[PDB]
Amino acid sequence: MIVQRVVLNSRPGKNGNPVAENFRMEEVYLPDNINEGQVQVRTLYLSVDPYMRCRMNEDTGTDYITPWQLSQVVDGGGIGIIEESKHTNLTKGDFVTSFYWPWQTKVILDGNSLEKVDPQLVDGHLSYFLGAIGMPGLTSLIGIQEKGHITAGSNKTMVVSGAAGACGSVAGQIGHFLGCSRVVGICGTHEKCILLTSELGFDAAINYKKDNVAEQLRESCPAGVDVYFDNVGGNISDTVISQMNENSHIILCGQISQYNKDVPYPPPLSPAIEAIQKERNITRERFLVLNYKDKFEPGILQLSQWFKEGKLKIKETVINGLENMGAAFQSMMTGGNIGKQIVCISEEIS
Ligand SMILES: NC(=O)C1=CN([C@@H]2O[C@H](COP(=O)(O)OP(=O)(O)OC[C@H]3O[C@@H](n4cnc5c(N)ncnc54)[C@H](OP(=O)(O)O)[C@@H]3O)[C@@H](O)[C@H]2O)C=CC1
Ligand SMILES: NC(=O)c1cccnc1
């Protein structure tokens, strides 16, 4: 009846950097009391995501995300299997997900807060529902469709920052699926650069820690940049914007280089860069995937189809054990992941 759970131990501060120690794992007893409409689930996988950085602050800065509470269990995207149900629409063995899954090994939840998933959409890789066939992938798809202005055969050049992460590795491929002739990725390591061009189909890759970014954009985007799928903001984006074309579009996915600072989101561009934006009529609007829930079902089917068609390559990085949730979040925030960071909590499904 003993389970492990992760609680928020301390807050780093809006200007601080997150560390594994901000999280603490403890044991609690799960009273075997399952009531009408509740189910008991065994957690299989949990996600860690950049937005969780905002939940670590007392104030998140937006109505759509609530702050985590000190000493209370943390929660986020999760996938699990139902071990017992007293909910009339859920059965033992069903696989389910929630965007508010407690970081705990076994949980008793209200069946109405869960969504039953279909394994065949992901060829049995349930963790994909937390990534490419889930919110990150929907964010890339919907962001490109809504903000990218790409048409088949316009021969536009797309640059993707955070290119080897969950949203960015998916965004680059979709840019090719939908019409961009050239897709260039910017990422933090040599190893990621290699994967971008050798496996994910990117035309070129730029390592921002070791290359002269401006020099490499000029060499790999000889015609300028028409669409920038921005995951990072900061200096990298100032550089990309510098080479963006008239009437180009920034899909403002996120600005992770700024998440450990108290600047409101999204940060403004500096005077000189905003001047370029205004002179060249570059569009930079906010994009929040939660504003498009009505596009979710068909987005998931589209992402699933591309995957089943052999076109979309889905990458993930796995860390094991609930005791490593904190380290996994810290690792993903600092570049340890290729693709979607996932934490495997259990494989027990019988
Ligand atoms: N608009 C929306 O609704 C949504 C937005 N997002 C946003 O998309 C972005 C990517 O999210 P996601 O794909 O889940 O996570 P990723 O898998 O991309 O993981 C984060 C990556 O960010 C990179 N990074 C971290 N710090 C910096 C830094 N200081 N400068 C440059 N790159 C950095 C790291 O890779 P590297 O080694 O290359 O530095 C790291 O692996 C985030 O900004 C997130 O907020 C996600 C979902 C929805
Ligand atoms: N900005 C983000 O990364 C984000 C992700 C999911 C929900 N809200 C915000």
Side-chain angles (χ1 to χ4, degrees):
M1 232 154 197
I2 307 183
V3 298
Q4 292 75 48
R5 67 173 203 163
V6 177
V7 303
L8 178 75
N9 186 71
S10 58
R11 294 194 195 263
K14 249 184 211 170
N15 298 296
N17 290 73
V19 295
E21 290 66 39
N22 285 142
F23 298 93
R24 183 181 42 97
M25 186 181 92
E26 57 180 26
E27 289 188 340
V28 294
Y29 298 98
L30 192 26
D32 153 43
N33 324 327
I34 298 164
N35 306 322
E36 189 46 38
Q38 295 184 323
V39 298
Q40 173 190 106
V41 296
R42 178 181 291 270
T43 308
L44 297 175
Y45 301 91
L46 291 171
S47 176
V48 289
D49 300 271
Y51 80 83
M52 296 176 174
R53 178 61 188 78
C54 309
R55 306 200 66 197
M56 295 178 90
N57 300 321
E58 198 169 42
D59 166 75
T60 72
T62 165
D63 293 4
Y64 299 121
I65 320 172
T66 63
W68 284 321
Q69 295 302 137
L70 287 173
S71 273
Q72 302 191 208
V73 63
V74 183
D75 67 303
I79 290 287
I81 182 169
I82 299 207
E83 307 199 302
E84 189 177 332
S85 170
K86 283 200 194 306
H87 187 283
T88 57
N89 208 20
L90 289 164
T91 308
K92 172 177 190 180
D94 277 354
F95 296 99
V96 294
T97 190
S98 172
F99 188 50
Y100 309 106
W101 196 291
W103 286 12
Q104 176 170 302
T105 54
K106 294 186 199 187
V107 204
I108 291 177
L109 301 169
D110 173 354
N112 296 328
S113 70
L114 301 177
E115 152 187 349
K116 180 177 171 182
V117 310
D118 182 3
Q120 88 85 52
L121 292 174
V122 299
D123 279 359
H125 288 263
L126 300 175
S127 57
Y128 289 1
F129 286 124
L130 300 177
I133 310 306
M135 184 277 278
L138 282 168
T139 299
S140 296
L141 180 51
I142 304 183
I144 285 168
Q145 289 174 151
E146 294 293 314
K147 305 290 191 197
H149 295 272
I150 302 169
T151 57
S154 37
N155 214 294
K156 287 182 175 185
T157 289
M158 173 185 271
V159 169
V160 183
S161 58
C167 294
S169 62
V170 165
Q173 302 177 68
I174 292 182
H176 273 144
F177 300 159
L178 303 186
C180 293
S181 50
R182 176 182 316 283
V183 179
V184 179
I186 299 175
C187 62
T189 77
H190 192 236
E191 299 79 24
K192 289 164 187 202
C193 280
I194 286 166
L195 294 180
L196 288 184
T197 60
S198 76
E199 194 195 349
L200 305 184
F202 283 64
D203 297 294
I206 305 182
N207 177 342
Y208 72 76
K209 286 183 197 157
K210 308 213 166 180
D211 300 339
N212 174 163
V213 181
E215 178 197 82
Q216 300 306 144
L217 279 173
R218 175 47 193 52
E219 186 176 321
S220 67
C221 304
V225 180
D226 304 300
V227 181
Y228 175 32
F229 189 102
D230 189 0
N231 282 307
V232 311
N235 306 305
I236 288 164
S237 289
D238 287 341
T239 299
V240 176
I241 296 169
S242 287
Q243 297 189 35
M244 282 192 78
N245 294 339
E246 316 284 327
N247 304 317
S248 54
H249 290 86
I250 301 182
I251 297 163
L252 196 64
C253 187
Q255 303 271 279
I256 193 163
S257 67
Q258 307 301 300
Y259 289 7
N260 299 318
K261 307 177 179 189
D262 62 37
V263 193
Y265 182 91
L269 295 178
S270 72
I273 301 309
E274 192 179 275
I276 293 176
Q277 195 213 339
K278 186 113 183 62
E279 263 145 34
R280 311 188 181 161
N281 191 41
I282 298 170
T283 303
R284 180 175 182 261
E285 299 172 348
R286 291 177 311 167
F287 175 70
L288 174 67
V289 69
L290 298 178
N291 285 160
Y292 306 88
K293 296 176 191 188
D294 71 281
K295 295 187 188 309
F296 283 18
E297 274 69 14
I300 292 301
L301 294 181
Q302 179 66 85
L303 289 159
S304 177
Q305 296 180 40
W306 282 329
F307 166 61
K308 287 172 151 288
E309 282 170 2
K311 288 147 77 187
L312 177 64
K313 304 323 173 303
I314 298 177
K315 302 292 292 183
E316 338 171 270
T317 293
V318 181
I319 283 168
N320 303 299
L322 187 81
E323 69 271 23
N324 290 311
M325 291 299 299
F329 171 74
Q330 191 292 316
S331 178
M332 171 278 295
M333 291 298 287
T334 60
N337 60 303
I338 286 183
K340 179 79 183 79
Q341 178 67 55
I342 288 299
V343 185
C344 177
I345 307 301
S346 179
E347 235 175 48
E348 202 35 57
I349 63 170
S350 309

